[PDB]
Design a protein around this nucleic acid. Structure first.
Ligand SMILES: [Zn+2]
Ligand SMILES: [Zn+2]
Ligand SMILES: [Zn+2]
Ligand SMILES: [Zn+2]
Lengths: 912, 913
DNA sequence: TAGTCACATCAGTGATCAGTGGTTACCACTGATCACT
DNA sequence: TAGTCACATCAGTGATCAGTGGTAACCACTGATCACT
């Protein structure tokens, strides 16, 4: 029973000639940095090969014909197993797919509804047990409801029944002989339940009842009825069944049984109201409302909104706590009528937004119903407008079914008006008995399993009624884990992305135990977490990419982890034997009692309303369990407000009250995790805004001037500069004319500085550091890129060849020094995702140097030594989910270390 | 190379807890009786694991060590008119993709490359380009053009400077071809001419010419400009299919002269196929006799000696109407008051009026021909099919139109495609597609299917070529260490048709692939590596493993009854000279000239056990089944199929009835049992209706059947097992709370007929149940035939999928070989060895020998040497495969077929008798 | 040489019913050059 | 501290299309039970 997988000859981008063995019955982690080829091998060489080998076999069958659109490009892999990938799916929208559908509970709940369906208004053992329990000596009748709900005249049926000579019949409860049948009319209602026997419960009678029952068992296909006619215990005429009411068919996504407005799978319940202006303490003149803080529309709406504020009588800048909350209420409801208003924006245009709006609730509705921006007109509706379906309570059913279907089990709210935890604890709380709680089967266990898995991980705060667009990072990283785990199949290979996003270190302290449980089941697991806890648990650790470019396209470590300590070349080994991941004691006194930001009263769904004290001019780090409110406060609340009214962004402030130091702040830059590199059009030089300047500089040459070639003509995406032979991709075997250069001969003649654009792109940035030195902007971009230390990339490198995680690192290098004050706050993502701790320590050297220059960084982190190097740590929430949302420590890393409450400090205290 | 497949927790009905572990480097064969555990073993242990593997991963029991396998079961592919032979050979879509890759439809940079390649110093007037044609008034358009600045124009057929606009009207049509410059050819002037053309490429939408603008205009501008259409690529969609015939294959309905195969028979007897019906024979005889009396042409005279005028007049009929109305044999009268249009136009109305479209296949493809010629056998639009290949040089550099599947064979199409040249583009690399095609093409070539033209379809599909194509297609991948699970793809039919297809398995085994073979053919055995015999018994107690891999262990083993013939333990022989007189009673199919036949005469003796051998799928299966068996069926019982072409049949006065049986697998539905298929259960329920405790309720014996709502327990679906599960898993068979392995309901179980209840009588095998029901002969003969064929321990109440489709299937025929006890009623039998294991082969051979010695007549399609040497007269057809066959090479006794030196089975008899 | 013997089973002969069998996007985000101060 | 006092050159900044990213017959099958003589 060998436990080895073998991969040979893998080649993709910088990765080349990879021959590695993956052991089983143990966890194996690939380490490295974003762009070293580890992500390419983890994602698009092994899983892609397995998927292709699985799908390419068959296409005719219409169950797997939906496959084979995927087109992976891998050489070969032998001795593989069908693997499953676990990573976020960037669909860019999930309105039609609620959280219930992605967790596979919707179809199951529909089957559960269909199982025990009673609208209010089988076996031979079931045939016999009731007559066995029938009291003796009781007069009754045999009933055969064979023409159920088929009202109308049935004299032809009377003649037909007379042909078999049953001699008995019963209509609407009245009994008659077949020889003397009652009159029937087509217009009148006539439900036929023909009496087969006017019998009675006496001794040795069971054969006549058996005959009179099996007659309709073979005629009506297994349905009869018994009817007490002398005792009727239980009803005025007690009867027993041996099987606005419209049964028809059951459907959820069909127009026959769906709401005419919500159109199925759409619920406008959203996350929370009041979210447009939930701040009672901000400076209102600093754009409390998101449309009031746009790049150019900010003043465009502030003009008449300040006019209406002056008219009504509430101040333009005073916080809503010195004023009553009536100010917030009256900016929500506003007032009718319009006033004269017109102003110019920063962009130079002049728009006349002349309309009547009833507060921000109807002002935003007017924006949805009036604006030409088809994106924002639905972007702004979701976060802060709650208008669910009134005719169906937001649910996926016709008006006149939802009441009846639950009357016997009244109206339907369920998945569209409930929460995940409430539904989880309510579904199994109904011990109905005979129908669903009779046999073990799978119903109760399958209901319990996934919901309990969500409970132990911590997804109890989620709600199905909540819009799927409000999915937090923790929810995104945990729901996929739970859904992958629910199968629990033994021997299947799992490959996972970086899990530090959405989870804490203490959360990893249980994710690792979950992974070891999965291993104890008998499967194979692969993670790229890079945390030191996942390391040291691998029998054969492998590290790749000593250099992310051609200088380091070789295997750097593959062994039993014993040689990691002695080998400092490997980055993960260089972290442990650091000489660089030390406390590095800073001044830690650059904080100021007054020159400091505060946030209070943030009563978000992930928070409680605590006061976070952000210092200025420091490397302050916000930490805590993910999903406990740190991201909703630092990013959704703080970064949003200083972005929208300190640089000109558009994000909604969210549920909070106050941010201070408005006079002490000038600019803010936010860099997200942002895995965005997938399209060949996007390049490390095109979106950065440097390629257009490169074209301008190249057109500043004499030859480009004489040949009449402009910067726009000198791009590779517009039809002017791209030859039709390449079709724009450069290599198709490359273009015959271009000969592997991606430039037509009519444009390649521009040899500025002895080189062309293709020559500059081909040349590495490390050797191009001497280039672009005089000209300022490209010099700054290239110099900060080199300061990052990853100058292996080319300017026009396609995004499919860029590993996820490093897409925004290049911009983030230049996104850390503005106005040279340099206290301008920069919100940082986690460098742990992608880059390993040696790359993060080089980044830390950059951060420390420019913080000594005067810069300010607010960073959400996951590791230990990187934030131990910092000077201030703020922990928000010790426990995950609802057990957090409050600050538990704020100060020097050693100060929080001494406090045995914050696990961040506890981690900083066990290693000093 | 050593991927250990482990089977644990495997059991299904007859199968019971079979566990094993094996490496993965050789071929695995399942032997034993048909089904009896091996069919379920090849189903619920590997395919079930693959199912529970892929059905979780598709998104939008526990078995480990196996590889993703492919299914080549019977249902996966059968005869369908929608799919031609191209799709099933996966070369239709394949070759279509390669054609669409870099095809040339035949009839910026190249604009200046033409001048660059043109030797310097020439002279030609490159003055005026062509812009897109516009018509109407363009005063403001020309004003805007002047604002831009061009200084040139050419409208209304006259050239002007742009400053001079001529007269334009909205009612006047102009071919607007404005000028852009006044340049001319010069040395090293490209930088000029480019600036004249390239910018125009952004305004004229890629239109520019170098016209003469001179006086003589001898040539039309040297045809210089800078039928072809892109269209769309699709085969099933109507985007690029035959718009009239909906993209279906051409309905080749040859021959029109199939109306009268045998001319010597009188036309009144029903020589015309619709004229020999059970009820419509006289319905058509009335008009043809009326026409014979009216026109005066003779009828009872054979067609060959008849005048051609009579034949044509009865073929196309005549005009006008006559008063004819008669009754049939079954008591209904048909008042046919219309015109007798021969048998040409009546058929068209017949298939036009009918609703069922399956009974018209025989009456359409073999009566008269009405195909659509717009596509002429092409599943492509008329333009593209020629356009794509008009630039594709093929074979000896011929580029006219795509024929391939439509109009060529394997050999010529492959040879022509091996010389494809679309320019130097595709010569720079060969690619893996070349070897992907070449491996399976060469494997098909060495098999011996060069004659197999691409025009083949379901209309000309045989079982042997079906095995050929399925095996070639599943080998075409040519992987290493990948499981291929296949049930019996078709009947085993010849030793020369096979034993050449198996060489591909031996070649592919060197790679390291592995396959599961559920095949009863003797040729597949003795040339493999690992063989296991499953199912010494066939009932629910029949799930057992006996035989081990190596054939040496087969020699050692005795329970695996393949050794009964492998080591020659027993065999059956010719039943002496029997009742075979030479000259008198010997039917002769003379002048059989069908599609593959060649006007040959074959003598089948009467009152004998005769067999047919030779190159199979080459006109001998049609010889025994298509022409002969159809004739006996339609002129001896009342069948409704055309026979084909044969000049005369003799000796039919010495036959009374015919029974014909195909391969006919029992099925794959658990609701079907051998009781309900053979016909035992009908009279079983009839007898159950006569029981003292079962004749008190009015209802018919239909209550005593497990297929109707009456005696049916609603928890089991008539199976003894709650097989209810969602699509994510096929569940494991479990007993019912009512049955516990009885597949019945207790209420019916009160019928203890002679102390035996229904569940009990369906729970004991026919071996023990033979003692019961002895006094009544109706069930006694059936149980005797079951126990004689070799189905004694068979469970009567057992699902069809896990039972015998080779021996228990043919009991419905063998029990009726006592047809009116004469018993020379003629029988036509398929290849029985499929499903038939060797012990059951011997038992059935003894039964058939006894019945034929009773005085029967049996013609069987057979290939095994032992069974044909058991029969007394072997007819061998086919000097070669396909068109090379169709003629007798040796017909007579086995000694005679071994005597004439033209029969492949004759030299097969030479090495072993 | 012809009107006498009981309310029987054949064996399919050989269309129809009925299990199955498979089959088919409005937005919206980032992309992005030249739209602006 | 007086009206101009010489000379372009970075930054991420909206709106939106543009052009990479996600797609029931057929009735062909055969078996079951069966209508008929
Ligand atoms: Zn609705
Ligand atoms: Zn090119
Ligand atoms: Zn056609
Ligand atoms: Zn049961």
């Amino acid at each position: 029973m060998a436990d080895r997988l073998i991969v040979k000859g893998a080649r993709e981008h910088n990765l080349r000639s990879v021959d590695l063995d993956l052991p089983r019955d143990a966890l194996i982690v690939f380490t490295g940095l974003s762009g070293s080829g580890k992500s390419s091998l983890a994602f698009d060489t092994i899983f892609a090969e397995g998927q292709r080998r699985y799908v390419e076999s068959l296409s005719a069958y219409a169950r797997q014909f939906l496959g084979q659109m995927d087109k992976p490009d891998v050489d070969f892999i032998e001795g593989l197993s069908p693997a499953v990938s676990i990573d976020q799916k960037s669909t860019n929208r999930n309105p039609r797919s609620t959280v219930g559908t992605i967790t596979e509970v919707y179809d199951y709940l529909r089957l559960l509804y269909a199982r025990a369906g009673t609208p209010h208004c089988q076996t031979p053992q079931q045939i016999v047990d009731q007559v066995l329990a029938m009291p003796e000596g009781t007069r009754f009748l045999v009933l055969a409801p064979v023409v159920r709900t088929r009202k109308g005249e049935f004299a032809d049926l009377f003649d037909k029944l007379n042909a078999q000579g049953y001699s008995r019949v019963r209509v609407d409860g009245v009994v008659h002989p077949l020889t003397d049948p009652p009159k029937l009319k087509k217009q009148e209602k006539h439900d036929i339940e023909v009496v087969v026997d006017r019998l009675t419960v006496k001794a040795a009678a069971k054969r006549r009842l058996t005959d009179s029952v099996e007659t309709a068992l073979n005629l009506a296909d297994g349905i009869v009825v018994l009817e007490f006619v002398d005792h009727e215990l239980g009803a005025p005429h007690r009867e027993q069944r041996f099987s606005d009411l419209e049964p028809r068919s059951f459907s959820f996504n069909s127009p026959y049984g769906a709401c005419p407005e919500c159109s199925g799978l759409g619920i406008r319940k959203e996350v929370d109201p009041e979210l447009v202006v939930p701040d009672p303490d901000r400076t209102l003149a600093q754009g409390a409302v998101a449309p009031w803080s746009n790049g150019h529309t900010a003043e465009y709406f502030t003009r008449m909104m300040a006019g209406l504020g002056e008219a009504l009588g509430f101040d333009v800048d005073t916080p809503w706590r010195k004023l009553p909350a009536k100010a917030r209420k009256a900016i929500l409801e506003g007032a009718d009528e319009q006033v004269h208003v017109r102003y110019r924006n920063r962009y130079g245009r002049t728009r006349s937004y002349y309309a009547d709006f009833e507060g921000v609730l109807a002002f935003l509705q007017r924006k949805m119903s009036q604006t030409e921006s088809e994106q924002m007109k639905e972007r702004y509706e979701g976060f802060m407008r709650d208008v669910p379906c009134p005719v169906c309570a937001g649910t996926r059913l016709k008006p006149e079914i939802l009441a009846v279907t639950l009357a016997g089990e009244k109206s339907i709210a369920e998945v569209c008006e409930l929460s995940i935890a409430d539904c989880a604890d309510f579904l199994n709380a109904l011990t109905l008995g005979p129908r669903e709680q009779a046999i073990a089967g799978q119903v109760l266990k399958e209901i319990r399993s996934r919901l309990g898995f969500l409970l132990d991980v911590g997804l109890e705060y989620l709600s199905l009624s909540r819009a799927a667009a409000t999915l937090s990072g923790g929810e995104a990283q945990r729901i996929r884990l739970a859904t992958q785990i629910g199968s629990g199949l033994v021997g299947v290979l799992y490959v996972l992305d970086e899990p530090s996003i959405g989870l804490h270190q203490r959360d990893n302290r249980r994710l690792i135990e979950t992974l070891t449980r999965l291993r104890d089941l008998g499967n194979t697991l692969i993670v790229v977490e890079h945390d030191e806890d996942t390391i040291e648990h691998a029998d054969w650790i492998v590290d790749i990419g000593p250099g992310a470019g051609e200088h380091g396209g070789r295997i750097v470590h593959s062994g039993p982890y014993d040689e990691l300590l002695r080998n400092k070349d490997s980055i993960t080994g260089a972290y442990l034997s650091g000489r660089e991941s030390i406390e590095i004691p800073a001044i830690r006194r650059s904080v100021d009692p007054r020159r400091q930001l505060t946030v209070v009263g943030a009563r978000e769904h992930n928070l409680r309303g605590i006061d976070v004290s952000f210092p200025l001019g420091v490397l302050t780090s916000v930490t805590g369990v993910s999903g406990s409110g740190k991201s909703t406060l630092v990013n959704d609340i703080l970064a949003a407000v200083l972005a929208n009214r300190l640089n000109g962004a558009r994000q909604v402030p969210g549920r909070h009250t106050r941010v201070t130091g408005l006079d002490y702040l000038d600019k803010l830059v936010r860099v997200d995790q942002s895995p965005i590199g997938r399209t060949p059009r996007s390049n490390p030089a095109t979106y950065t805004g440097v390629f257009d300047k490169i074209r301008t500089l190249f057109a500043a040459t004499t030859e480009a001037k004489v040949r009449g070639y402009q910067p726009g003509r000198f791009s590779f995406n517009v039809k002017g500069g791209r030859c039709e032979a390449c079709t724009g991709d450069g290599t198709i075997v490359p273009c015959e004319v271009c000969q592997g250069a991606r430039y037509n001969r009519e444009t390649l003649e521009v040899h500025y500085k002895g080189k062309t654009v293709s020559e500059v792109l081909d040349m590495s940035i490390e050797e191009a550091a001497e280039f672009f030195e005089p000209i300022a902007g490209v010099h700054r971009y290239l110099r900060t890129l080199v300061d990052v230390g990853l100058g292996y990339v080319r300017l026009g490198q396609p995004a499919p060849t860029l590993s996820g995680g490093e897409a925004q690192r290049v911009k983030l290098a230049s996104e850390l020094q503005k106005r040279s004050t340099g206290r301008t706050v920069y919100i940082l993502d986690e460098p742990t995702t992608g880059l390993h701790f040696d790359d993060i320590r080089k980044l830390l050297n950059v951060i420390n140097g420019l913080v000594d220059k005067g810069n300010t960084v607010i960073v959400i982190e996951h590791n230990l030594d990187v934030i131990k190097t910092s000077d201030w740590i703020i922990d928000l929430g010790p426990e995950g989910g609802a057990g957090g949302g409050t600050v538990v420590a704020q100060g020097t890393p050693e100060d929080v270390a001494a406090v045995p409450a914050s696990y961040t400090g506890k981690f900083l205290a066990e290693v000093v």
